[PDB]
Structure 1
Amino acid sequence: ELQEKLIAVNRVSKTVKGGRIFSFTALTVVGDGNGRVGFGYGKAREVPAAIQKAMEKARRNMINVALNNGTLQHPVKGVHTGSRVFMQPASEGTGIIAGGAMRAVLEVAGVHNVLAKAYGSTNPINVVRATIDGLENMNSPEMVAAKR
């Protein structure tokens, strides 16, 4: 079924009237591998509590990437905040060439081959958001045709 991948976890600390209260954040990527992706980022007083809470959120917000022969339909450049992500389809045998943030989201996405690169801000939280956004704008000739 759905497979989860732990993108990254941060300690995250903040000053409050009384001392320091620690809350852990966690990026999780849920995907079956046949076209469905899911990003989740939830916090919690405990690491595992955040991880699980994250997975639940990831499964609540999924996207149906229109995969084509282990690749995508066309290159896309999504720009979230200061972060920027680019994607480019590639023939088979190239492999998923991209950062851990994007790759993990692409692997579960079912993507078998793709050429990508991170631009601007390298923030892992902003890049994953940019990646998913790009996976949404993805359109196929069928959609475009039926769209026009």
Structure 2
Amino acid sequence: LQEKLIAVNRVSKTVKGGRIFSFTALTVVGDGNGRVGFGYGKAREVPAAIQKAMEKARRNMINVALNNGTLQHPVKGVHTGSRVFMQPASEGTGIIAGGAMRAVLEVAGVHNVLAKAYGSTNPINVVRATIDGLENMNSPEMVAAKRGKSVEEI
């Protein structure tokens, strides 16, 4: 599995004494072949937070039906305030996406894609929107299956 650290953030809660700082780590993991998951870890230290995130990511992986390291069709993904658009691209396009979407698409095994993040670009929600977009993407076979047709008829 390829692993990527998207974001580390210092968060704080107040107590009687003062402030207690801690760290959050957002990570994605993927096999580079249409399997991808994200993880979010919290700890008092940065490396502990990353380790927790990576462990979470490995167990929460979903399957994406790719085509030649690009998408099957244009997809929209939404989570919270994040709305993402992703489109299939030709070979040699590369990942034309912002960093959070790029990390997801790279480990998933999407080599060629045109993307755009609308609304909030908060990494935590962009990653959820992106994976939401990918996981509800249909291949021609499942479309043919559900409609009760052959793939050439589709």
Q: Same fold (TM over 0.5)?
A: yes
Structure 1 match to 2:152: none
> Contact 1:63 / 1:135 at 8 angstroms: preserved in 2?
no
1:81 deviates by 1.0
1:110 deviates by 0.5
Using the alignment, how far apart are the partners of 2:44 and 2:125 within structure 1?
A: 23
Aligned residues: 147
Segments of 4+ moved more than 4 angstroms: none
Using the alignment, how far apart are the partners of 2:47 and 2:142 within structure 1?
A: 40
Using the alignment, how far apart are the partners of 1:97 and 1:10 within structure 2?
A: 25
Using the alignment, how far apart are the partners of 2:35 and 2:77 within structure 1?
A: 19
SS of alignment partner, residue 107 of structure 2: helix
List per-residue Cα deviations over 1:72-118 (Å, max 9, x = no partner).
Answer: 10111112111111100011111110011001110111011000001
Structure index of larger Rg: 2
Using the alignment, how far apart are the partners of 1:79 and 1:112 within structure 2?
A: 22
Q: How does 1:61-72 map to 2 (within 5 A)?
A: 61-72=60-71
Using the alignment, how far apart are the partners of 1:86 and 1:17 within structure 2?
A: 45
1:16 deviates by 2.2
List per-residue Cα deviations over 1:40-69 (Å, max 9, x = no partner).
Answer: 011011111010000000011111111101
Q: How does 1:104-115 map to 2 (within 5 A)?
A: 104-115=103-114
1:17 deviates by 2.9
TM-score normalised according to structure 1 size: 0.96
Structure 1 match to 2:86: 87
Using the alignment, how far apart are the partners of 1:50 and 1:18 within structure 2?
A: 24
Using the alignment, how far apart are the partners of 2:9 and 2:81 within structure 1?
A: 20
Are 2:16 and 1:17 aligned? yes
List per-residue Cα deviations over 1:7-54 (Å, max 9, x = no partner).
Answer: 010011121233211110001111110111110011011111010000
Structure 1 match to 2:42: 43
> Contact 1:74 / 1:88 at 8 angstroms: preserved in 2?
yes
TM-score normalised according to structure 2 size: 0.92
SS of alignment partner, residue 79 of structure 2: coil
